[PDB]
Amino acid sequence: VYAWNRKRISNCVADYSVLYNFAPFFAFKCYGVSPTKLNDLCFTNVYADS
Amino acid sequence: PTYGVGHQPYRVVVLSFELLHAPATVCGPKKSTNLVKNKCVNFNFNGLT
Amino acid sequence: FVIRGNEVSQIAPGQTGNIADYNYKLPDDFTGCVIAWNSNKLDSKVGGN
Amino acid sequence: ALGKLQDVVNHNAQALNTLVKQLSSKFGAISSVLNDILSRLDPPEAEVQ
């Protein structure tokens, strides 16, 4: 957690349906955006912090 | 593994985005429609409706 | 009905899921109560239910 | 010499301009664009925004 991994996401087409197709995710909490409208919005500044 | 919930390790990952303040590079499998001129249409340009 | 433990948040007005849009949808002006409880003792089998 | 009538015009158009500029205000919401709020959020939080 003190050295949390930050990964770039750019220049790709992301299918967020496979988040829900296979899902061990007990907590799925989005703050400023709908989860099912994630497939309809085009993004940059996408970061994955694990 | 013998501990109960409240002290078990959870893998937590945060996805961060931005909205519309920059050119976009990532979105979903929605397929493009052809472009029309001089016609009243509702458009979805990179998430901008 | 019987669903997964992580899908009990999806039985709500305006929520997002597979069971939300393809199996059971609630209206936006829905009033009432959702009751969700674990059924591991009855609705689960060691060989797979 | 004609400053009165011009001031009347310079009130009225300025007021209309200010009213147009009030559409760019978030008013405590995530965005000042309604279409962005519709395309970004579920309807229960779209109610609030």
mmCIF file of C-alpha atoms in Angstrom:
data_model
loop_
_atom_site.group_PDB
_atom_site.id
_atom_site.type_symbol
_atom_site.label_atom_id
_atom_site.label_comp_id
_atom_site.label_asym_id
_atom_site.label_seq_id
_atom_site.Cartn_x
_atom_site.Cartn_y
_atom_site.Cartn_z
ATOM 1 C CA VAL A 1 0.000 0.000 0.000
ATOM 2 C CA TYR A 2 2.904 2.412 0.537
ATOM 3 C CA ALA A 3 4.305 1.450 -2.881
ATOM 4 C CA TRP A 4 0.956 1.130 -4.682
ATOM 5 C CA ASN A 5 1.208 0.272 -8.365
ATOM 6 C CA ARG A 6 0.006 2.925 -10.826
ATOM 7 C CA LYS A 7 -0.476 1.699 -14.391
ATOM 8 C CA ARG A 8 -1.159 3.817 -17.483
ATOM 9 C CA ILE A 9 -4.117 3.087 -19.749
ATOM 10 C CA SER A 10 -4.024 4.735 -23.175
ATOM 11 C CA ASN A 11 -4.464 3.981 -26.901
ATOM 12 C CA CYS A 12 -6.716 0.970 -26.372
ATOM 13 C CA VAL A 13 -10.357 -0.035 -26.737
ATOM 14 C CA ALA A 14 -11.618 -1.236 -23.361
ATOM 15 C CA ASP A 15 -14.510 -3.667 -22.987
ATOM 16 C CA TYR A 16 -15.865 -3.072 -19.485
ATOM 17 C CA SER A 17 -18.472 -5.797 -19.970
ATOM 18 C CA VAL A 18 -15.778 -8.340 -19.045
ATOM 19 C CA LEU A 19 -15.536 -6.664 -15.641
ATOM 20 C CA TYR A 20 -19.025 -8.021 -14.998
ATOM 21 C CA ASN A 21 -18.681 -11.231 -17.049
ATOM 22 C CA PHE A 22 -16.043 -12.600 -14.664
ATOM 23 C CA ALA A 23 -16.163 -10.814 -11.314
ATOM 24 C CA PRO A 24 -14.728 -11.725 -7.910
ATOM 25 C CA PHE A 25 -15.265 -8.072 -6.952
ATOM 26 C CA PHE A 26 -16.994 -7.810 -3.589
ATOM 27 C CA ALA A 27 -16.977 -3.985 -3.592
ATOM 28 C CA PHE A 28 -17.608 -2.108 -6.871
ATOM 29 C CA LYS A 29 -18.147 1.549 -5.925
ATOM 30 C CA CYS A 30 -17.988 4.301 -8.551
ATOM 31 C CA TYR A 31 -18.095 7.918 -7.410
ATOM 32 C CA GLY A 32 -18.465 10.367 -10.296
ATOM 33 C CA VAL A 33 -19.679 8.060 -13.075
ATOM 34 C CA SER A 34 -22.317 5.402 -13.724
ATOM 35 C CA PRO A 35 -21.004 1.826 -14.072
ATOM 36 C CA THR A 36 -23.200 0.856 -17.047
ATOM 37 C CA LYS A 37 -22.484 4.159 -18.802
ATOM 38 C CA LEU A 38 -18.750 3.424 -18.676
ATOM 39 C CA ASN A 39 -19.187 1.668 -22.036
ATOM 40 C CA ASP A 40 -20.555 4.873 -23.597
ATOM 41 C CA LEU A 41 -17.981 7.441 -22.405
ATOM 42 C CA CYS A 42 -14.607 8.093 -24.025
ATOM 43 C CA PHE A 43 -11.739 8.709 -21.665
ATOM 44 C CA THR A 44 -8.178 9.677 -21.156
ATOM 45 C CA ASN A 45 -6.276 10.007 -17.831
ATOM 46 C CA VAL A 46 -7.142 6.388 -16.999
ATOM 47 C CA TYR A 47 -5.000 5.049 -14.166
ATOM 48 C CA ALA A 48 -5.127 1.703 -12.351
ATOM 49 C CA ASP A 49 -3.788 1.890 -8.779
ATOM 50 C CA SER A 50 -3.472 -1.528 -7.133
ATOM 51 C CA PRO B 1 -6.111 -17.177 6.752
ATOM 52 C CA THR B 2 -7.395 -18.077 10.235
ATOM 53 C CA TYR B 3 -8.524 -14.494 10.887
ATOM 54 C CA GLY B 4 -12.092 -13.454 10.163
ATOM 55 C CA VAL B 5 -13.348 -10.514 8.145
ATOM 56 C CA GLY B 6 -12.212 -7.052 9.177
ATOM 57 C CA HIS B 7 -8.552 -8.107 9.147
ATOM 58 C CA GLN B 8 -8.407 -10.249 5.993
ATOM 59 C CA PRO B 9 -6.399 -8.756 3.106
ATOM 60 C CA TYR B 10 -8.416 -7.144 0.334
ATOM 61 C CA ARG B 11 -6.881 -6.333 -3.024
ATOM 62 C CA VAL B 12 -8.087 -2.787 -3.711
ATOM 63 C CA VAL B 13 -7.633 -1.113 -7.091
ATOM 64 C CA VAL B 14 -8.679 2.425 -8.001
ATOM 65 C CA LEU B 15 -9.558 3.360 -11.566
ATOM 66 C CA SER B 16 -9.167 7.081 -12.215
ATOM 67 C CA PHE B 17 -10.463 8.937 -15.285
ATOM 68 C CA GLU B 18 -11.026 12.483 -16.493
ATOM 69 C CA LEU B 19 -14.066 13.976 -18.215
ATOM 70 C CA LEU B 20 -13.913 15.871 -21.506
ATOM 71 C CA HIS B 21 -11.032 18.275 -20.700
ATOM 72 C CA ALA B 22 -8.612 16.473 -23.047
ATOM 73 C CA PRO B 23 -8.670 14.367 -26.230
ATOM 74 C CA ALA B 24 -9.785 10.842 -25.385
ATOM 75 C CA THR B 25 -8.076 7.574 -26.296
ATOM 76 C CA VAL B 26 -10.062 4.799 -24.547
ATOM 77 C CA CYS B 27 -13.728 3.667 -24.715
ATOM 78 C CA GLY B 28 -15.974 0.735 -25.407
ATOM 79 C CA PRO B 29 -17.058 -1.549 -28.244
ATOM 80 C CA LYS B 30 -19.689 0.854 -29.620
ATOM 81 C CA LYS B 31 -19.483 0.955 -33.407
ATOM 82 C CA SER B 32 -19.278 4.135 -35.450
ATOM 83 C CA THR B 33 -22.109 5.486 -37.595
ATOM 84 C CA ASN B 34 -21.551 7.415 -40.831
ATOM 85 C CA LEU B 35 -21.390 11.203 -40.812
ATOM 86 C CA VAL B 36 -24.327 13.365 -41.876
ATOM 87 C CA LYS B 37 -24.363 17.032 -42.857
ATOM 88 C CA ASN B 38 -27.072 19.718 -42.581
ATOM 89 C CA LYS B 39 -29.507 17.379 -40.809
ATOM 90 C CA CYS B 40 -30.975 17.607 -37.308
ATOM 91 C CA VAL B 41 -29.428 14.615 -35.530
ATOM 92 C CA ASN B 42 -28.408 13.642 -32.029
ATOM 93 C CA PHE B 43 -24.696 12.846 -31.954
ATOM 94 C CA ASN B 44 -22.306 11.102 -29.563
ATOM 95 C CA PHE B 45 -18.781 12.434 -30.208
ATOM 96 C CA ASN B 46 -16.359 10.722 -27.781
ATOM 97 C CA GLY B 47 -18.935 10.589 -24.995
ATOM 98 C CA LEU B 48 -20.204 14.116 -25.732
ATOM 99 C CA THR B 49 -23.922 13.825 -26.510
ATOM 100 C CA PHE C 1 -35.418 -14.753 -6.546
ATOM 101 C CA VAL C 2 -31.906 -16.010 -5.748
ATOM 102 C CA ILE C 3 -28.818 -14.099 -6.902
ATOM 103 C CA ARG C 4 -25.159 -13.708 -5.978
ATOM 104 C CA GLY C 5 -23.920 -11.916 -2.890
ATOM 105 C CA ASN C 6 -22.346 -9.105 -4.890
ATOM 106 C CA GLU C 7 -25.498 -8.546 -6.987
ATOM 107 C CA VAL C 8 -27.766 -7.513 -4.086
ATOM 108 C CA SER C 9 -26.752 -3.893 -4.705
ATOM 109 C CA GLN C 10 -28.026 -4.251 -8.290
ATOM 110 C CA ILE C 11 -31.666 -4.774 -7.185
ATOM 111 C CA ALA C 12 -32.412 -1.056 -6.904
ATOM 112 C CA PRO C 13 -33.852 1.745 -9.056
ATOM 113 C CA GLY C 14 -31.355 2.914 -11.644
ATOM 114 C CA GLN C 15 -28.698 0.329 -10.812
ATOM 115 C CA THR C 16 -26.281 -1.301 -13.226
ATOM 116 C CA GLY C 17 -25.913 -5.003 -13.925
ATOM 117 C CA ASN C 18 -26.703 -8.017 -16.076
ATOM 118 C CA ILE C 19 -29.639 -9.114 -13.922
ATOM 119 C CA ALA C 20 -30.652 -5.440 -13.690
ATOM 120 C CA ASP C 21 -31.311 -5.042 -17.423
ATOM 121 C CA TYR C 22 -31.802 -8.609 -18.717
ATOM 122 C CA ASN C 23 -33.556 -10.369 -15.807
ATOM 123 C CA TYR C 24 -35.264 -7.942 -13.401
ATOM 124 C CA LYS C 25 -35.586 -4.160 -13.684
ATOM 125 C CA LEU C 26 -37.033 -1.823 -11.031
ATOM 126 C CA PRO C 27 -38.715 1.469 -12.014
ATOM 127 C CA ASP C 28 -37.109 4.786 -11.135
ATOM 128 C CA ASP C 29 -40.029 5.753 -8.858
ATOM 129 C CA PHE C 30 -39.978 2.434 -6.982
ATOM 130 C CA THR C 31 -41.002 2.490 -3.319
ATOM 131 C CA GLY C 32 -40.691 -0.478 -0.995
ATOM 132 C CA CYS C 33 -38.071 -2.632 0.685
ATOM 133 C CA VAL C 34 -35.414 -5.083 -0.490
ATOM 134 C CA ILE C 35 -34.677 -8.046 1.778
ATOM 135 C CA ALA C 36 -31.457 -9.924 1.033
ATOM 136 C CA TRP C 37 -30.141 -12.759 3.174
ATOM 137 C CA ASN C 38 -27.547 -15.502 2.856
ATOM 138 C CA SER C 39 -28.847 -18.981 2.011
ATOM 139 C CA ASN C 40 -25.668 -21.048 2.185
ATOM 140 C CA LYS C 41 -27.280 -23.609 4.503
ATOM 141 C CA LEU C 42 -30.212 -24.308 2.153
ATOM 142 C CA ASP C 43 -29.408 -23.095 -1.386
ATOM 143 C CA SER C 44 -25.875 -24.506 -1.617
ATOM 144 C CA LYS C 45 -24.521 -28.010 -2.201
ATOM 145 C CA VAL C 46 -21.013 -29.366 -1.673
ATOM 146 C CA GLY C 47 -21.117 -30.903 -5.159
ATOM 147 C CA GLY C 48 -22.444 -27.649 -6.607
ATOM 148 C CA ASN C 49 -25.985 -26.254 -6.667
ATOM 149 C CA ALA D 1 -25.242 63.380 -25.104
ATOM 150 C CA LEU D 2 -27.299 60.247 -25.872
ATOM 151 C CA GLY D 3 -26.030 58.405 -22.802
ATOM 152 C CA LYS D 4 -29.442 57.712 -21.246
ATOM 153 C CA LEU D 5 -30.926 55.628 -24.081
ATOM 154 C CA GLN D 6 -27.601 53.874 -24.643
ATOM 155 C CA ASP D 7 -27.472 53.104 -20.907
ATOM 156 C CA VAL D 8 -30.929 51.487 -21.190
ATOM 157 C CA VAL D 9 -29.645 49.277 -24.033
ATOM 158 C CA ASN D 10 -26.399 48.669 -22.104
ATOM 159 C CA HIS D 11 -28.457 47.484 -19.146
ATOM 160 C CA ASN D 12 -30.770 45.184 -21.047
ATOM 161 C CA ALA D 13 -28.244 43.411 -23.292
ATOM 162 C CA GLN D 14 -25.833 43.096 -20.338
ATOM 163 C CA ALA D 15 -28.572 41.413 -18.281
ATOM 164 C CA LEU D 16 -29.240 38.965 -21.123
ATOM 165 C CA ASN D 17 -25.488 38.300 -21.380
ATOM 166 C CA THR D 18 -25.305 37.640 -17.625
ATOM 167 C CA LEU D 19 -28.249 35.251 -17.884
ATOM 168 C CA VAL D 20 -26.435 33.405 -20.681
ATOM 169 C CA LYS D 21 -23.261 33.243 -18.530
ATOM 170 C CA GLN D 22 -25.277 31.722 -15.679
ATOM 171 C CA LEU D 23 -25.641 28.563 -17.807
ATOM 172 C CA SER D 24 -21.894 27.905 -17.410
ATOM 173 C CA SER D 25 -22.169 27.624 -13.613
ATOM 174 C CA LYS D 26 -21.944 24.251 -11.895
ATOM 175 C CA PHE D 27 -24.141 25.397 -8.942
ATOM 176 C CA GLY D 28 -22.557 22.733 -6.754
ATOM 177 C CA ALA D 29 -22.990 19.948 -9.318
ATOM 178 C CA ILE D 30 -20.388 17.869 -11.137
ATOM 179 C CA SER D 31 -20.954 19.697 -14.433
ATOM 180 C CA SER D 32 -22.863 22.622 -15.901
ATOM 181 C CA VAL D 33 -23.792 20.543 -18.969
ATOM 182 C CA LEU D 34 -26.984 18.526 -18.560
ATOM 183 C CA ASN D 35 -26.086 16.086 -21.342
ATOM 184 C CA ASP D 36 -22.812 15.242 -19.584
ATOM 185 C CA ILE D 37 -24.743 14.517 -16.372
ATOM 186 C CA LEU D 38 -27.212 12.329 -18.294
ATOM 187 C CA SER D 39 -24.438 10.437 -20.091
ATOM 188 C CA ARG D 40 -22.282 10.059 -16.962
ATOM 189 C CA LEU D 41 -24.605 9.059 -14.114
ATOM 190 C CA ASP D 42 -27.400 6.719 -13.164
ATOM 191 C CA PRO D 43 -30.854 8.400 -12.930
ATOM 192 C CA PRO D 44 -31.026 8.387 -9.060
ATOM 193 C CA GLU D 45 -27.950 10.643 -8.827
ATOM 194 C CA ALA D 46 -28.934 12.440 -12.018
ATOM 195 C CA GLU D 47 -31.942 13.536 -9.920
ATOM 196 C CA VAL D 48 -29.613 15.309 -7.478
ATOM 197 C CA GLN D 49 -27.282 16.863 -10.069
#
